[PDB]
Amino acid sequence: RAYKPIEIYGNINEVVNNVQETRAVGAAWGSDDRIGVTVEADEDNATANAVDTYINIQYRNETGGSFRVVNEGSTDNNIRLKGEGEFTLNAYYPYQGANGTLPGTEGVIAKTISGADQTTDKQPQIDFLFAQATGVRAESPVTFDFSHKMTKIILKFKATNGATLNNMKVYLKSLQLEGSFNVTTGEAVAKSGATPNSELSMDIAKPAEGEMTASIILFPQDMPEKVLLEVRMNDETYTQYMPVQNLESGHAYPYNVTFENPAMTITKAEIEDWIVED
Ligand SMILES: [Cl-]
Ligand SMILES: [Cl-]
Ligand SMILES: [Cl-]
Ligand SMILES: [Cl-]
């Protein structure tokens, strides 16, 4: 017989600033956000056609956390699970690749992070999310609970004792900028091996109102012992080494960068959950 499609929704686990709490939230998707959905396991049939056809199927955010399958031309790409058994499904964001095949190298997406990736427009393309849903039923709604698998550095700038904040050019040296995201397991990890001469740079504009901050999404990694922060501001160069730590998946690591006239100081703030810009 003809089996109806499954209906897909998505929550993202992150800090909601207006309530100051880590929550599952489905109202924080961008209007054209794309996810890839894979049927991992069919508990009734160990060697079924579902687990073979329904791999990396593209879905688009319709409104809220509600997703609709992407159909270009006269296609019907909906996932139609069959039977009364349970299924395991995986999902990830941002979608890439083709339907029926795992993206990258057997599900492993390689990427080299730069400062150009940290703009408003480009930072969502390296903000890798993963979800796994167990006990999924045929012809039913399923909600994926996505987690941010990357790590984040937040630089919070302040000026005291007569110093003034101006537009900056910020440099972070010796971080591991290359890494990979596995869409099958959700593991996001920086490549092994030290890269002491690596450099990430960004232009940070002095805002008209509020706090001046910079956020850097990176692959999770244990920072090397020496990470230099260089700031070019109002025709002056400030350099200071960072207090280093291990940068884990799903956490934000804020640093208080203060221009105390004349010194630029760096202190580590308390580890946070996934902080987003309001
Ligand atoms: Cl920007
Ligand atoms: Cl002061
Ligand atoms: Cl640590
Ligand atoms: Cl510190």
112 Cβ neighbours under 8 A, 6+ residues apart: 177, 178
Backbone angles phi, psi at 51, to 5 degrees: -60, -25
* Angle at 85 (CA atoms; ends 82, 89), nearest 5 degrees: 80
Distance from C-alpha of 116 to C-alpha of 164, rounded to nearest angstrom: 26
Distance from C-alpha of 63 to C-alpha of 58, rounded to nearest angstrom: 16
Residues in the chain: 278
Unique residue bearing structure tokens 């990427």: 111
Domain limits, the chain: 1-153, 154-278
Which ligand sits closest to the CA of 158?
2
Distance from C-alpha of 96 to C-alpha of 110, rounded to nearest angstrom: 12
Q: Where are the beta strands (DSSP E) in 70-150?
A: 87-93, 108-112, 129-136, 141-148
Tokens of 164: 């003034």
What's the gap in Å between 39 CA and the centre of ligand 1? 36
Backbone angles phi, psi at 16, to 5 degrees: -95, 110
What's the gap in Å between 60 CA and the centre of ligand 1? 24
Which ligand sits closest to the CA of 256?
4
Residues with CB under 5 A from ligand 4 (ion): 243, 267-268
CATH topology of domain 154-278: Immunoglobulin-like (2.60.40)
Pairing of strands 246-247, 221-222: antiparallel
Tokens of 70: 């992407």
Whether CATH 2.60.40.2620 fits 1-153: yes
Asked, as a colleague might, if the bond just before 5 is cis with ω within 30 of 0, I would say no
Tokens of 105: 């190298």
Distance from C-alpha of 58 to C-alpha of 96, rounded to nearest angstrom: 8
Give percent helix, percent strand, percent coil of the chain, each to the nearest 5.
5, 45, 50
What's the gap in Å between 43 CA and the centre of ligand 3? 40
Instruction: Check if 1-153 and 154-278 are the same fold.
Output: yes
251 Cβ neighbours under 8 A, 6+ residues apart: 151, 152, 271, 272, 273, 274
How would you classify residue 125: left for phi > 0, otherwise alpha for psi between -120 and 50, otherwise beta? alpha
Distance from C-alpha of 12 to C-alpha of 94, rounded to nearest angstrom: 13
Are 92 and 107 in contact by the 8 Å Cβ rule? The answer is no
Neighbour-count burial of 135, counting CB atoms closer than 10 A to its CB (0-12 exposed, 13-18 middle, 19+ buried): exposed
Please report, as a single letter, which amino acid is at residue 228. L
Tokens of 144: 């994926």
Distance from C-alpha of 123 to C-alpha of 29, rounded to nearest angstrom: 14
Distance from C-alpha of 50 to C-alpha of 64, rounded to nearest angstrom: 27
